């Protein structure tokens, strides 16, 4: 029952106007109910990132594990935020 | 290779049965997926996501497929049941 809801929710999950940190927390919370393997989860996680994070990621060699990709994207966000100020 | 994998992960997510046949959709899906490293649960869920609504609705009256081939076979039989002369 949880798995069905999770597969729907994760596909709709977006960073959108919000932060990588909140997106990543919600993503891992939902993904714990999924039986997708790590490559599929990485691709879904990337799909939901905001355009500006995806643009920054395109300049970099992207981590090939989900936890490392989350760390990479959080760092990108933190850097852009510190630059804004 | 990594490049084929990147292409595959974008193409599989945009692939849709639309107004076309289950067999054409399924052959295209499996062709793309040969270059992916997603496990069978993730492929099942993506395949379902791309089906036409009229096939998806009829799936609810059937046993839940536990393999990609089983789901494809169900959809082929549903299509044959619904097809106009």
Curated annotation (Swiss-Prot), chain A:
Expressed in the cytotrophoblast layer but not in the overlying syncytiotrophoblast of the placenta. Expressed in prostate and breast carcinomas but not in normal breast and prostate epithelial cells. Expressed in the Hep-G2 cell line (at protein level). Expressed in brain, liver, spleen, kidney, thymus, lung, ovary, testis, reactive lymph node, skeletal muscle, adipose tissue and placenta. Expressed in pancreatic and hepatocellular carcinomas (HCC). Disulfide bonds: none annotated. Can be reprogrammed to form virion-like capsids that deliver engineered cargo mRNAs bearing RNA signals from PEG10 5'- and 3'-UTR into target cells. It is found in: Extracellular vesicle membrane; Cytoplasm; Nucleus. It comes from the Eukaryota. Induction: Expression is directly regulated by E2F1 and E2F4, which bind to its promoter and direct its expression. Up-regulated by MYC. Strongly overepressed in a number of tumors, such has hepatocellular carcinoma (HCC), pancreatic or neuroendocrine prostate cancers. The protein is evolutionarily related to retrotransposon Gag proteins: it contains the capsid (CA) and nucleocapsid (NC) subdomains of gag. The PEG10 locus is imprinted, giving rise to paternally expressed proteins. Retrotransposon-derived protein that binds its own mRNA and self-assembles into virion-like capsids. Forms virion-like extracellular vesicles that encapsulate their own mRNA and are released from cells, enabling intercellular transfer of PEG10 mRNA. Binds its own mRNA in the 5'-UTR region, in the region near the boundary between the nucleocapsid (NC) and protease (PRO) coding sequences and in the beginning of the 3'-UTR region. Involved in placenta formation: required for trophoblast stem cells differentiation. Involved at the immediate early stage of adipocyte differentiation. Homooligomer; homooligomerizes into virion-like capsids. Interacts with ACVRL1. Interacts with SIAH1 and SIAH2. This is Retrotransposon-derived protein PEG10. It comes from Homo sapiens (Human). The lineage of its organism: Eukaryota, Metazoa, Chordata, Craniata, Vertebrata.
